[PDB]
Write a protein that binds this DNA or RNA. Structure first.
Lengths: 50, 98, 50
DNA sequence: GGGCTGGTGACGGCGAATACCC
DNA sequence: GGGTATTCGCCGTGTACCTCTCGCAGCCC
RNA sequence: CCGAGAGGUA
């Protein structure tokens, strides 16, 4: 049911929608979406469980 | 053809914003996508706005907003921000010349 | 109020009125010297928000 | 010497603003 | 083109009193 | 002699 509510279809559209829910109302770019989603959870700088 | 745009900075750090903007241009070497950077001055209007000769790609837009101490462009919308005008650029250059 | 240290920790109202008068004087000067209309739209937005 | 410049453990009620469905 | 349903923001949460500390940096004009 | 923040009495 979750995948039936999804409008997205590939990696790029998902990264665009996540970049759009983070910072509202601005043009996304594939480099900016990759950089944001790698700096949310997957970087030693901005994310750190102890 | 490169048209003009208005950038808002933290008012007071404007010369440092202009220098950092020129340096980010010569770092990310989009040299064919930037013409000048104006901060006009009388013996200082405009109080906190930086004029940029530019073109509009989303890469150059992210470049100017990734320059530090820059809030954003000032236009009708944030998708396609707004250039100003022909005669308005000519009058600003007129009073800068005068 | 004086705090007996050579300085005045001001009340919040004088800060607010000072912000409105700063922004209004800058808007009078920008309507004086024929600023481009995008900048006076931004300046009026700032005055409304102050 | 000094001017001025911009977090992420509260919960219920309630009414206004969408929403969807026919 | 309305009749019910779900979201979204606001409004609100006891009274007196006592003691203490601390209240805007930056900076190159 | 105003506001915060902390503590305490009933």
């Amino acid at each position: 049911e979750t995948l039936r509510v999804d409008p997205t279809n590939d990696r790029l559209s998902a990264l665009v929608e996540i970049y759009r829910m983070m910072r509202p109302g601005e043009p996304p770019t594939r480099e900016a979406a990759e950089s944001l989603f790698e700096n949310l959870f997957f970087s030693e700088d901005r994310y750190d469980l102890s | 053809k490169k048209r003009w745009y208005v950038v808002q900075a933290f008012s007071g750090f404007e010369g440092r914003v202009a220098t950092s903007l020129r340096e980010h241009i010569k770092l990310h070497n989009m040299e064919d996508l930037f013409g000048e950077v104006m901060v006009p001055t009388e013996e200082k209007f405009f109080p906190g706005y930086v004029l940029v000769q530019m073109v509009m790609n989303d890469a150059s837009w992210h470049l100017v907003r990734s320059v530090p101490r820059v809030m954003g462009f000032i236009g009708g919308t944030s998708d396609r921000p707004a250039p100003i005008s022909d005669k308005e650029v000519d009058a600003i250059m007129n009073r800068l010349q005068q | 109020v004086p705090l007996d240290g050579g300085r005045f920790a001001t009340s919040d109202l004088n800060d607010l009125y000072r912000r409105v008068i700063n922004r209004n004087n800058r808007l009078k000067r920008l309507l004086d010297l024929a600023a481009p209309d995008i900048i006076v739209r931004n300046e009026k937005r700032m005055l409304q928000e102050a």
